Ligand binder design. Sequence first.
Ligand SMILES: Cn1cc(-c2nc(C(=O)NC(=N)N)c(N)nc2N2CCCCCC2)cn1
Length: 245
Amino acid sequence: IIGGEFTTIENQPWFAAIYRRHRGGSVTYVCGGSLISPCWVISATHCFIDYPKKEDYIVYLGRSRLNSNTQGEMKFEVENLILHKDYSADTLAHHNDIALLKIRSKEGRCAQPSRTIQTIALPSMYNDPQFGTSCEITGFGKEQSTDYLYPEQLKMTVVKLISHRECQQPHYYGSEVTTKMLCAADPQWKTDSCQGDSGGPLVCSLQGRMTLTGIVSWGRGCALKDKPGVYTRVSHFLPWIRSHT
Ligand SMILES: Cn1cc(-c2nc(C(=O)NC(=N)N)c(N)nc2N2CCCCCC2)cn1
């Protein structure tokens, strides 16, 4: 997250922190995700496509820091890694960049909701907020495009939804953006998602309910003028989600 503010898991208790085991035992951060039911986390396919083996991954819930434990956190193995069959990557844009992880503990249990662990509602189909609506994004991704490290403390910021028509201008993304994607950005291009925020939540208030409107997917640079963040449009994938859960 470029700009924005530091936060803790209580302000985004559906946030899932996804790591991968190596090859000798080191564990490194991969991507964010969102808890949509006790046993299911939703994220982006591009996070897993190069290492599509479920046994390689670890999911934490209730975690506010990257490389230290948070009191009350839960750790899970991945019982099921479901990547979207129609995924594709061109140079910049990822199509159908959506993935489901079924989580199970060594004790074989799903998530127990607590003060630091809650689910997030999915939207109703084809129902998103209007352009210019302010939404929030959360993650452990870079604080600057040039950074080598990820922040140790969770961050969040606010971005405004951009119209498909605006996003498709050549100056923006041209045809790279489809109707199954959403664009969002700061009016000053001052704050944004970045590398390491992939898979995490774009949350909007719809009908007075916090709703998983988007999943961080891609962008050209971070917080660059005319280059919004691009998000998987969750309201266009509900059958896929429902079928696979
Ligand atoms: C040098 N480099 C990378 C990025 C990057 N950016 C984003 C991103 O969300 N960008 C944005 N909202 N403007 C992203 N989801 N993934 C990224 N990457 C790049 C794609 C390949 C690995 C994932 C990290 C930005 N600058």
